[PDB]
Amino acid sequence: ALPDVRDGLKPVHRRVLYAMNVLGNDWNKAYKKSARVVGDVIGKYHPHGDSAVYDTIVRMAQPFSLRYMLVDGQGNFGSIDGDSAAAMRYTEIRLAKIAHELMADLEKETVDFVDNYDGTEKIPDVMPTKIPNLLVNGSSGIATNIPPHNLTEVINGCLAYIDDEDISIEGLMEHIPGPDFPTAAIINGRRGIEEAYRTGRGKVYIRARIIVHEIPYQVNKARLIEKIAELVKLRDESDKDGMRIVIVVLNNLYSQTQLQVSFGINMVALHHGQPKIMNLKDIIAAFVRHRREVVTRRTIFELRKARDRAHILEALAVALANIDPIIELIRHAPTPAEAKTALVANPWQLGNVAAMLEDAARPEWLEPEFGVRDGLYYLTEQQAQAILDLRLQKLTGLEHEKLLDEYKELLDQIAELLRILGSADRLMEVIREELELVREQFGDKRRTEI
Amino acid sequence: ALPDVRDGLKPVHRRVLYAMNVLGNDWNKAYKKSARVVGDVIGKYHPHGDSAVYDTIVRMAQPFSLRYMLVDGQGNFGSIDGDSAAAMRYTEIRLAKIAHELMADLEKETVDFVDNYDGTEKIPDVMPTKIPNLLVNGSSGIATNIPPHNLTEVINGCLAYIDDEDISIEGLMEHIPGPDFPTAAIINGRRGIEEAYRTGRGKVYIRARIIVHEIPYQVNKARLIEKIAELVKLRDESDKDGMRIVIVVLNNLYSQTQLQVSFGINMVALHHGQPKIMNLKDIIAAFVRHRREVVTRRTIFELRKARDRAHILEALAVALANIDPIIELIRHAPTPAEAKTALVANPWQLGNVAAMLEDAARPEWLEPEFGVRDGLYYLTEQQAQAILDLRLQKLTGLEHEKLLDEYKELLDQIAELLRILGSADRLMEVIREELELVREQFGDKRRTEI
Numbered sequence: 001a002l003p004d005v006r007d008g009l010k011p012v013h014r015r016v017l018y019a020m021n022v023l024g025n026d027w028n029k030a031y032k033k034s035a036r037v038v039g040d041v042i043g044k045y046h047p048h049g050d051s052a053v054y055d056t057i058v059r060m061a062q063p064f065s066l067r068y069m070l071v072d073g074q075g076n077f078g079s080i081d082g083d084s085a086a087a088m089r090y091t092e093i094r095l096a097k098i099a100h101e102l103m104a105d106l107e108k109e110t111v112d113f114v115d116n117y118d119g120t121e122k123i124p125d126v127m128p129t130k131i132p133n134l135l136v137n138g139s140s141g142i143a144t145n146i147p148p149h150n151l152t153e154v155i156n157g158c159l160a161y162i163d164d165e166d167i168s169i170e171g172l173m174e175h176i177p178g179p180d181f182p183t184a185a186i187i188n189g190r191r192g193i194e195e196a197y198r199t200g201r202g203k204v205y206i207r208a209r210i211i212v213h214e215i216p217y218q219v220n221k222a223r224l225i226e227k228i229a230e231l232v233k234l235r236d237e238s239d240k241d242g243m244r245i246v247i248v249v250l251n252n253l254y255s256q257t258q259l260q261v262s263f264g265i266n267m268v269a270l271h272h273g274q275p276k277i278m279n280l281k282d283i284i285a286a287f288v289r290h291r292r293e294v295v296t297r298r299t300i301f302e303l304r305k306a307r308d309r310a311h312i313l314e315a316l317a318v319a320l321a322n323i324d325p326i327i328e329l330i331r332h333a334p335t336p337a338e339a340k341t342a343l344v345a346n347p348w349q350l351g352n353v354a355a356m357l358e359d360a361a362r363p364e365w366l367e368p369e370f371g372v373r374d375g376l377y378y379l380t381e382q383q384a385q386a387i388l389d390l391r392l393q394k395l396t397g398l399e400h401e402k403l404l405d406e407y408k409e410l411l412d413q414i415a416e417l418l419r420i421l422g423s424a425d426r427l428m429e430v431i432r433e434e435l436e437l438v439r440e441q442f443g444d445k446r447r448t449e450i
Numbered sequence: 451a452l453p454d455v456r457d458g459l460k461p462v463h464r465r466v467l468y469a470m471n472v473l474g475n476d477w478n479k480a481y482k483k484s485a486r487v488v489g490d491v492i493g494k495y496h497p498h499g500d501s502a503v504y505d506t507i508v509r510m511a512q513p514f515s516l517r518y519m520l521v522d523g524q525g526n527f528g529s530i531d532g533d534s535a536a537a538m539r540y541t542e543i544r545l546a547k548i549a550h551e552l553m554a555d556l557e558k559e560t561v562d563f564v565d566n567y568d569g570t571e572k573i574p575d576v577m578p579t580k581i582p583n584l585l586v587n588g589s590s591g592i593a594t595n596i597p598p599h600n601l602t603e604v605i606n607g608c609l610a611y612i613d614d615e616d617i618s619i620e621g622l623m624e625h626i627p628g629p630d631f632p633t634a635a636i637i638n639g640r641r642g643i644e645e646a647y648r649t650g651r652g653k654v655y656i657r658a659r660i661i662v663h664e665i666p667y668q669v670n671k672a673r674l675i676e677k678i679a680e681l682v683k684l685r686d687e688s689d690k691d692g693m694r695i696v697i698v699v700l701n702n703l704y705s706q707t708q709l710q711v712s713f714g715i716n717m718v719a720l721h722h723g724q725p726k727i728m729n730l731k732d733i734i735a736a737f738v739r740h741r742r743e744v745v746t747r748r749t750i751f752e753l754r755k756a757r758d759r760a761h762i763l764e765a766l767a768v769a770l771a772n773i774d775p776i777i778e779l780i781r782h783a784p785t786p787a788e789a790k791t792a793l794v795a796n797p798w799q800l801g802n803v804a805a806m807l808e809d810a811a812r813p814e815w816l817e818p819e820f821g822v823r824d825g826l827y828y829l830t831e832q833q834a835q836a837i838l839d840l841r842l843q844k845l846t847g848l849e850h851e852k853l854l855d856e857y858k859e860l861l862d863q864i865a866e867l868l869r870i871l872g873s874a875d876r877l878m879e880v881i882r883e884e885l886e887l888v889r890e891q892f893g894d895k896r897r898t899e900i
């Protein structure tokens with residue numbers, strides 16, 4: 001019921017986006033019918049059959065609901081007049097490009113996973129988000145009430161915090177002057193913004209921009225129009241190219257109608273598994289600390305993966321340099337178990353890959369009796385099984401070359417990853433550069449006037 | 451909305467059972483949560499989110515609903531008193547053993563498949579059922595109304611029809627004297643049974659077996675009890691070990707209460723894509739004709755599959771008999787494309803598999819320039835790619851032996867399949883023997899007294 005402070009998501013949102021990721025329902029592939037994603041979420045992650053899962057998909061696609069849409073939707077996803085989306089069998093969805101940034105590096109052991117409801121699947125506890133989504137898209141529930149914000153502004157605030165962790169709320173507000181609604185309009189109550197940013201709680205007012213061009217966030221246009229007719233105890237000329245409501249009285253309309261509304265900001269989020277009231281700085285610090293954890297864990301993962309792969313490739317290169325005796329050995333083995341034991345029994349000469357093979361690339365788990373030792377290769381059982389799994393086409397010149405090239409590139413990736421892990425400065429710089437690139441790729445203009 | 455005469459299923463039932471088959475949710479594996487199957491059905495086959503999919507799962511598991519349950523359910527699936535099943539996240543299901551007979555040989559091109567709703571999946575149009583499910587489990591909908599029947603009886607009727615296609619309705623009724631309800635009780639109206647079997651339509655009456663031990667099919671026990679209290683302008687002592695309702699008056703109760711109900715038999719099913727009223731003989735003939743189509747198509751499929759596999763294995767055996775020159779060829783090939791062209795360029799000597807290799811096993815699509823020709827093997831490109839895909843462990847003695855043994859068994863399977871396809875007598879005998887085995891494995895005692 002409360003969003004996680006780190007990714008801004010509640011469980012239902014996270015389960016939806018996760019299912020889309022697992023489906024490969026990517027920004028650069030064909031749309032899928034909404035029903036497919038709904039069915040996957042219901043069966044694997046959120047085993048309830050009411051309207052919440054599809055409702056969440058629909059909200060995440062509506063440009064009048066989310067400041068940065070997380071779902072790219074095609075078809076009828078409803079309108080600001082409150083009409084419903086078409087049924088899930090008709091609408092088409094895929095991940096928005098920015099949703100890939102929310103889930104960047106999820107496959108790289110960057111976040112803890114928890115059991116799904118039947119213990120057959122894992123689900124991330126939180127997304128390894130590059131986007132400060134809690135602030136930029138906001139959240140509500142009945143309690144928390146966090147308005148959306150401009151991504152450029154929020155990223156600038158994160159970077160200012162990284163530069164000076166003692167930055168004041170006033171300092172942060174030089175970069176983040178207030179909320180930014182997808183529906184634009186006007187905010188009127190600067191003290192309310194400051195009190196929210198300082199304490200977590202502050203009430204602000206949102207005013208429409210007689211011709212009405214923009215209305216407050218979360219106001220239903222058709223209901224607004226009916227409300228005006230009822231108080232009159234007007235035409236809607238809006239279209240695809242923008243909103244246009246046609247109607248002294250204006251101040252009166254602002255006084256008794258949703259042409260002005262209050263927004264009670266109440267920044268409550270899950271923080272270390274507990275609900276907590278959080279100010280602007282708490283929220284930014286939590287996001288930054290999350291980036292530190294993610295990037296560290298990612299770098300460790302990549303280093304491990306690269307060493308593991310390089311280790312398998314060493315075996316393959318040695319076998320392919322010793323192809324005749326390898327074949328002679330396997331052909332005379334009664335069974336695959338005996339071939340594997342014969343492979344590991346006696347070390348192998350390195351041949352023309354000697355220079356290429358001769359500590360940085362050794363997996364940390366590899367005991368000292370294995371690997372290159374005195375110009376000879378001592379294979380593990382796993383390495384022997386990889387030789388036994390080699391297809392005959394890997395003996396052709398090009399496939400042999402590709403393996404050697406892959407090994408060489410891994411050696412360079414490993415040296416680089418060690419330099420990064422070994423340097424707090426490098427690691428912090430990766431974090432910053434990632435934020436800055438997010439700003440360059442996805443940052444847009446402010447819409448709401450403060 | 452109407453069941454297919456051949457499998458007795460409506461689309462929703464077929465989509466449920468199909469999803470369970472695709473999931474591998476088999477009788478001899480662990481139960482899965484109902485929600486998983488629901489989610490898969492909704493996402494892939496039946497993209498509507500109301501109660502129908504789960505309701506269908508629940509009905510198929512209830513021993514008071516289906517004469518032969520198609521779902522094996524564990525947990526609370528509701529009762530004859532009309533209480534609801536527990537929610538889908540709590541109940542556990544797998545296919546009943548007999549449901550595997552309903553879908554036997556589905557993977558062997560035995561039935562036509564149709565597009566699912568988004569054109570990303572195939573769904574069978576009908577199941578290749580060994581079970582005459584329309585009769586044994588019945589159907590209803592608002593119209594068709596077909597009561598359930600005893601499997602032993604119905605199979606005996608099918609076999610009697612196969613022996614004499616001119617069998618009369620009276621002849622069939624020597625094997626099938628009437629319906630058989632899962633809830634037992636008593637049928638009172640033999641003319642109604644005969645008129646239904648002769649014409650498709652007949653009305654019959656079902657009577658409870660004061661102590662009530664059995665009640666009519668589709669009667670809710672709790673509602674029956676309330677109905678008796680209302681007319682009285684009694685205790686339920688039923689338990690896990692059987693039904694027991696405790697209450698001259700009896701005849702009166704039979705006259706004004708569901709201790710007796712009418713069942714209007716109306717045997718309407720889909721037949722060649724059209725709704726048709728069908729008599730007993732029409733229904734049996736349709737099932738038998740379906741078995742003829744299935745077994746023919748299955749036999750053709752197996753023959754094709756076996757020839758295809760044998761053809762790939764011939765290439766592998768020849769390569770493994772020529773392992774040195776094969777390796778020399780591939781090692782000196784600049785790329786896998788050049789290795790493949792070199793493999794196919796020149797025919798191969800047969801070596802010690804000559805006797806084993808030397809028309810019955812040739813795929814029907816294989817042009818005469820390929821295969822064994824004058825003691826030499828001419829490879830296709832596909833066969834060359836299979837050699838290139840061979841893992842080094844296939845050179846060990848045991849893996850080499852397993853390949854040769856597989857080829858030998860395929861040769862014998864192919865000779866047998868040709869004998870069957872070539873003989874209407876053999877083919878009809880397979881059909882009969884399959885029915886008889888169904889009767890032996892799944893046949894049980896009559897429950898309802900006529």
Ligand SMILES: CC(=O)O[C@@H]1[C@@H](C)O[C@@H](c2ccc3c(c2O)[C@H](O)[C@]24O[C@@]2(C3=O)[C@@]2(O)C(=O)C=C(C)C[C@@]2(O)C[C@@H]4O)C[C@H]1OC(=O)/C=C/C=C/C=C/C=C/C(=O)Nc1c(O)c2ccc(O)c(Cl)c2oc1=O
Nearest residue numbers: 012047048049050052137138139140499500501504537538
């Ligand atoms: C507290 C509560 O509501 O409990 C519900 C309970 C009463 O009912 C459960 C339920 C309903 C119906 C059925 C079921 C249920 O469990 C049987 O599971 C059932 O599915 C039912 C069936 O009908 C069957 O009968 C049925 O009828 C249909 C189907 C398909 C299946 C079934 O045959 C069988 C099955 O057993 C769902 C259950 O819901 C849950 O467990 C969890 C709900 C989570 C909702 C989160 C909503 C979030 C909204 C939200 O965040 N608003 C947002 C914002 O304000 C918001 C603001 C800013 C912003 O940026 C964002 Cl992104 C925002 O995003 C937002 O989403």
Ligand SMILES: CC(=O)O[C@@H]1[C@@H](C)O[C@@H](c2ccc3c(c2O)[C@H](O)[C@]24O[C@@]2(C3=O)[C@@]2(O)C(=O)C=C(C)C[C@@]2(O)C[C@@H]4O)C[C@H]1OC(=O)/C=C/C=C/C=C/C=C/C(=O)Nc1c(O)c2ccc(O)c(Cl)c2oc1=O
Nearest residue numbers: 049050051054087088462497498499500502587588589590
């Ligand atoms: C004619 C009709 O009823 O149309 C329905 C239409 C009115 O409503 C459709 C529908 C309902 C709800 C929703 C939807 C629908 O399309 C949105 O698809 C929706 O799912 C809805 C949502 O709530 C969402 O809002 C929602 O609220 C919940 C979820 C999870 C998804 C959504 O957020 C979004 C989604 O767009 C379903 C739609 O149903 C169908 O298309 C097909 C229904 C087939 C039913 C077959 C029942 C068979 C019973 C039967 O055979 N009885 C049996 C016997 O008597 C019987 C007798 C003997 C025997 O042996 C057997 Cl086996 C027997 O078996 C039997 O089954």
